[PDB]
C-alpha cells in the first residue's frame, strides 16, 4: 500500500554477492590508494618530471579514497539494501551526488594533464625543461580540483529529498532523487558524459598514442633509464585510460537509460533489470577506484605485452615464420596493430607470406580487421597481387564487398593494378561488378583508366552476365 511502488525487488543473493564485491573493492582500494598517498607524500625526487608525475598520481589516489571512504558505504546502505527511506537528509543527498560528480571530473582532468606532461617530456624535452616547474604543476592541480567542484554544482540543484509515498506524507516514502524535469536532468547527465568521459578520454588516448609512436621513432633513430621510465609511464597511462572507459561506460549508459526511456516502456521487468544493472555499473565504478595502484605494479608486465605485440608485427612483415609461431604460443596479441592500423595479418597479406597468413588465421586473427582508412587484409592482397592469400582469406570468411572511406572495394583494386587472375576469383565469390566509389568509378572504369584492356573485357563480360539474369 503506502510505499509498495518504491520497493526494488532484487533477490537476497544479489545483495550479499554485491556486498562482498563492494567490501573487497573497499579494502583493496583503500590499502592500494592509502599506501600510494602515504609514500608519494614522504617522497622527494631530484628530477622535476618525477615530482610532477607523483603530484598527479597523488590527486588520482585522493579522488579514489573520497569515493571508497564516503560514497561506497552510503551507496551500500541506501541504494543496495534499504531503498527507502533515505537516512542522510537533504544536505547528505546533495553532498553524496556532488562528491561523486566532482571526483569523475578530477580523475578525467588529472589523466588528461598527465598525458600532456608525458607528451611534452617525449616530444618537446628542451622546452619542457624550462616551461615546466613543480610549484606551477601544484597550482594547476588546485585549479583542476576547483574546476571539478564548479562542474559538479548542477548536482546541488538537480538532486534532493522528495516524499514519493502515495499522498507524500508517509516518512517511509522519503527518497534522495532528481527534483528537476527530465529535460533539465538530460542536460546535466549529458554534460557529465561529454566532459568527464568522452571528451577527456578521447584527448588522453590521442596524446598517449602519439607519445608512444614518437618515443619508438626517437629511440629507433639518449638516456636508457629515461626511455625505460617514459615507456612504462605511456603504457601504464594507456591501461588507466582503457580501465576508465570500460568501468564507466555501463554507468553512463544506465544514467542515459534513466532520462531517455519513456514511462510506457518502464515495465516492472525493465524496472527490475535497471536495479540489477545499477549493482553491476556501481561495482565497476569502485573497480575504477581500486585498480590504478594495481596497474602501477604491472608496469613491467605491460612493457612485456607491448614488446611481444611489436615483435609479432616485425615477425609477420619481415617473413620470420618460426618467430610468429613462438610469439603466438607465448600469448602475443594476434589482433595488435601499428601506427597505420595494420594488424600482423595486414602486414602478412601485404608482403606475401602465405604461411604466416595461415598460421595467424589458425590462432584466431580478425580476418576483417580495418586500418584507419578501412582497408581489410583482402584490400591489401588484391592491391599487391597475391592470388593464394585472396583464396585463403576468402575461405576464412573475408568480406568480398568491404569498402574503405572512399568506397573502394577489393574488385576496384584488383582491376586498377592489372591483376586479371584476382578479378576472376573476386567475381566468383560475389563481388558487385558495378560497385561505385565516392566519385562513381566502377572496377570496369578503373580497368580502362590504367590501360588494362584485357581486364576491362572480363569485367564487361561480368557486367553483361548480370544483364542476362532478368
Amino acid at each position: 500500500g503506502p510505499n509498495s511502488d518504491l520497493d526494488v525487488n532484487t533477490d537476497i543473493y544479489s545483495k550479499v554477492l554485491v556486498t562482498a564485491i563492494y567490501l573487497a573493492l573497499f579494502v583493496v582500494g583503500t590499502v592500494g590508494n592509502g599506501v600510494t598517498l602515504f609514500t608519494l607524500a614522504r617522497k622527494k625526487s631530484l628530477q622535476s618530471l618525477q615530482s610532477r608525475v607523483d603530484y598527479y598520481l597523488g590527486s588520482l589516489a585522493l579522488s579514489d579514497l573520497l569515493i571508497l571512504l564516503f560514497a561506497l558505504p552510503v551507496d551500500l546502505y541506501n541504494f543496495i539494501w534499504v531503498h527507502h527511506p533515505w537516512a542522510f537528509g537533504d544536505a547528505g543527498c546533495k553532498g553524496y551526488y556532488f562528491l561523486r560528480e566532482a571526483c569523475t571530473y578530477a580523475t578525467a582532468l588529472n589523466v588528461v594533464s598527465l598525458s600532456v606532461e608525458l607528451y611534452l617530456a617525449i616530444c618537446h624535452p628542451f622546452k619542457a625543461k624550462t616551461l615546466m616547474s613543480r610549484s606551477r604543476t601544484k597550482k594547476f592541480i588546485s585549479a583542476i580540483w576547483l574546476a571539478s567542484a564548479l562542474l559538479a554544482i548542477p548536482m546541488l540543484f538537480t538532486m534532493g529529498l522528495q516524499n514519493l509515498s502515495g499522498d507524500g506524507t508517509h516518512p517511509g516514502g522519503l527518497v534522495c532523487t532528481p527534483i528537476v524535469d527530465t529535460a533539465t536532468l538530460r542536460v546535466v547527465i549529458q554534460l557529465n558524459t561529454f566532459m568527464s568521459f568522452l571528451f577527456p578520454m578521447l584527448v588522453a588516448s590521442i596524446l598517449n598514442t602519439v607519445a608512444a609512436r614518437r618515443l619508438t621513432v626517437m629511440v629507433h633513430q639518449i638516456e636508457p633509464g629515461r626511455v625505460q621510465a617514459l615507456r612504462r609511464g605511456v603504457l601504464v597511462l594507456r591501461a588507466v585510460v582503457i580501465a576508465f572507459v570500460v568501468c564507466w561506460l555501463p554507468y553512463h549508459v544506465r544514467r542515459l537509460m534513466f532520462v531517455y526511456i519513456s514511462d510506457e516502456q518502464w515495465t516492472t521487468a525493465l524496472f527490475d533489470f535497471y536495479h540489477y544493472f545499477y549493482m553491476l555499473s556501481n561495482a565497476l565504478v569502485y573497480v575504477s577506484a581500486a585498480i590504478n595502484p594495481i596497474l602501477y605494479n604491472l608496469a613491467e608486465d605491460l612493457v612485456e605485452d607491448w614488446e611481444k605485440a611489436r615483435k609479432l608485427l616485425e615477425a609477420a612483415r619481415k617473413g620470420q615464420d618460426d618467430e610468429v609461431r613462438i610469439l603466438l604460443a607465448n600469448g602475443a596479441d594476434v589482433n595488435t596493430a601499428d601506427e597505420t592500423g595494420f594488424t600482423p595479418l595486414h602486414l602478412a597479406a601485404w608482403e606475401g607470406h602465405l604461411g604466416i597468413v595461415e598460421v595467424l588465421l589458425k590462432n584466431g586473427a580478425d580476418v576483417n580487421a580495418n586500418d584507419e582508412r578501412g582497408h581489410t587484409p583482402l584490400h591489401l592482397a588484391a592491391y599487391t597481387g597475391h592470388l593464394e592469400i585472396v583464396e585463403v582469406l576468402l575461405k576464412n570468411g573475408a568480406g568480398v564487398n568491404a569498402t574503405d572511406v572512399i568506397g573502394t572495394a577489393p574488385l576496384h583494386l584488383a582491376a586498377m593494378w592489372g591483376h586479371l587472375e584476382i578479378v576472376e576469383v573476386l567475381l566468383k565469390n560475389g563481388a558487385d561488378v558495378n560497385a561505385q566509389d565516392k566519385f562513381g568509378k566502377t572496377p570496369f572504369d578503373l580497368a580502362i583508366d590504367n590501360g588494362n584492356e584485357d581486364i576491362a573485357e572480363v569485367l564487361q563480360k561480368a557486367a553483361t552476365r548480370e544483364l542476362e539474369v532478368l
Partner: peptide
C-alpha cells in the same frame, strides 16, 4: 508499465 526508477 509507467513505474520509472527514482534512484540515479
Amino acid at each position: 508499465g509507467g513505474r520509472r526508477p527514482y534512484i540515479l
